[PDB]
Design a protein around this nucleic acid. Sequence first.
DNA 1: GGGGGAAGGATTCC
DNA 2: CGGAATCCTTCCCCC
Length: 341
Amino acid sequence: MIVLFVDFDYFYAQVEEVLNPSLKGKPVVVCVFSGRFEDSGAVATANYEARKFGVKAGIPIVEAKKILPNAVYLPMRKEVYQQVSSRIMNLLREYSEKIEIASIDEAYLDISDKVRDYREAYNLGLEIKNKILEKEKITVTVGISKNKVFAKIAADMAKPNGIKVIDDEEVKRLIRELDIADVPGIGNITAEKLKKLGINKLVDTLSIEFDKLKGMIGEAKAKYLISLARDEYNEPIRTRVRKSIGRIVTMKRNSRNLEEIKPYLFRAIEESYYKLDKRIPKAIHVVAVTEDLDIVSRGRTFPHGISKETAYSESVKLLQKILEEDERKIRRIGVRFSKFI
DNA sequence: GGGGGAAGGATTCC
DNA sequence: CGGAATCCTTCCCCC
Ligand SMILES: [Ca+2]
Ligand SMILES: [Ca+2]
Ligand SMILES: [Ca+2]
């Protein structure tokens, strides 16, 4: 198996650089403004000229504006990035049919039946990089290895605008001397949680006992890291479909008033059904972010599709169930639909 | 004992 | 002091 991984570099910010070439060379920060005070929100994407000064995705906008006060701060236009991303994805499927779109800015290509060795794959990645650059002016990073995890690791090491092949020998080497926190799927919570057991490298998960690792980081991520340490990970490249569509809005003013929250919730439903397009959902969940930024959610699955009018009635019932079983105020309210037909 | 699925909190990531 | 989506553990019914 030879998997090729393509990751669009700082995608959100690069599309803004492409749509306005006056921005390249300058620090660019793509933000999400909730709309409470003037600069309330978070950073979604920052280019590398902004990441060098500590501006990274996740931090508040005012924390970014304290570091780079005159950097270019633009609002996030997800609909634009999704259309550009879909165009690039269509270029990728001309190189292989077995494609796994993992996110808006990355996809896995199974080029086992198109390429003999890692040299042919490296030359294929160079042509994929040039094509994306020629047709969309977007630079990507290419990772090639024996499975999806190490193909993504290759791109993680050579980003941005890079290419890297991890052969069978470097895999066994990376198993011993790669930080466990830089394994795909290992976020911050599991990483710090893994440091509390001395687990710093991938090889160390074998020298521990399974039930100890299972009770701490969960059985799922336990078997995941074990299979990688045994060099037995070989998950296939499968077509990924979108399973959930929802929209959450930050309400102006916190509230526990049903009539005050309903307009936001009904607005969230309308925008959710518009993005649903022809998809008919059978499950609906009402989710609320409390004043202390905690999340509470109530759901309900139907034996049939949910019409928009049914979603209106059921969402009020679920939101009432939230207010009945939690006494905190609500800061953000929203809905999510799943279990399509 | 566990299949099968629903509920919803917990993580990951742009 | 965002927001989208998936992950994944528990719980439940019942054969
Ligand atoms: Ca990216
Ligand atoms: Ca990515
Ligand atoms: Ca990580």
